[PDB]
Amino acid sequence: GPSLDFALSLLRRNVRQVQTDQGHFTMLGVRDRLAVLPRHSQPGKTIWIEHKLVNVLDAVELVDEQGVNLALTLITLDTNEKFRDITKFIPENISTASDATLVINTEHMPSMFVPVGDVVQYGFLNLSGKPTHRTMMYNFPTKAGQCGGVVTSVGKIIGIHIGGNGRQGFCAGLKRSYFA
Numbered sequence: 705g706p707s708l709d710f711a712l713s714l715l716r717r718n719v720r721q722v723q724t725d726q727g728h729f730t731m732l733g734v735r736d737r738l739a740v741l742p743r744h745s746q747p748g749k750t751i752w753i754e755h756k757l758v759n760v761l762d763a764v765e766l767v768d769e770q771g772v773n774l775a776l777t778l779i780t781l782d783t784n785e786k787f788r789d790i791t792k793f794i795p796e797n798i799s800t801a802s803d804a805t806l807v808i809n810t811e812h813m814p815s816m817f818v819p820v821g822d823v824v825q826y827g828f829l830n831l832s833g834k835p836t837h838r839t840m841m842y843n844f845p846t847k848a849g850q851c852g853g854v855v856t857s858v859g860k861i862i863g864i865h866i867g868g869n870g871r872q873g874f875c876a877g878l879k880r881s882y883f884a
């Protein structure tokens with residue numbers, strides 16, 4: 705109950721359908737006008753968000769003290785909307801999970817929840833040939849169209865879906881300091 709329920713609350717207040725020139729993605733709204741996307745979505749100066757065109761004030765590929773690719777892009781949106789601040793639900797350190805749910809919301813895959821099970825430490829990932837770090841893995845057959853999906857455990861927001869090989873899926877881990 706509490707876990708699936710947490711995922712459903714997040715969907716409504718913080719998860720949005722977007723489209724870039726690279727296709728359809730799920731977006732996590734983090735706080736106020738700040739959101740996060742998979743880097744592969746390559747957001748431009750304008751993005752579609754639930755059937756409206758929105759100006760992008762800033763977009764930054766995420767960097768930290770390790771100086772590694774993390775497969776995420778932070779964006780600040782030129783919008784009236786202010787996301788409820790969910791940073792307190794993001795752990796300070798990358799966190800695995802026993803019973804995670806992947807929350808997907810795109811125009812093609814609207815408002816869906818997928819129990820992916822265990823989310824385990826994985827680390828380095830060559831993602832279609834691009835070196836990527838700080839990933840976690842689930843033994844679930846994730847699909848094209850699910851990138852940006854939000855990986856949650858009860859009371860915690862732990863990852864963003866970025867890739868998979870047909871049998872397993874991979875997320876970029878989330879840490880609170882990314883959003884400081």
Ligand SMILES: CCOC(=O)CC[C@H](C[C@@H]1CCNC1=O)NC(=O)[C@@H](CC(=O)[C@@H](NC(=O)c1cc(C)on1)C(C)C)Cc1ccc(F)cc1
Pocket residue numbers: 727744829830831832833834846847848849850851866867868869870872873874
């Ligand atoms: C084009 C449509 O794009 C999307 O739908 C975005 C979401 C999908 C979801 C995948 C889609 C499939 N099962 C999934 O879960 N992600 C990708 O396709 C990514 C590539 C893979 O997942 C690669 N997997 C690995 O490398 C990989 C490595 C190991 C280990 O496991 N997977 C491809 C071989 C599938 C897209 C990408 C390409 C170049 C990059 F710089 C970085 C990312």
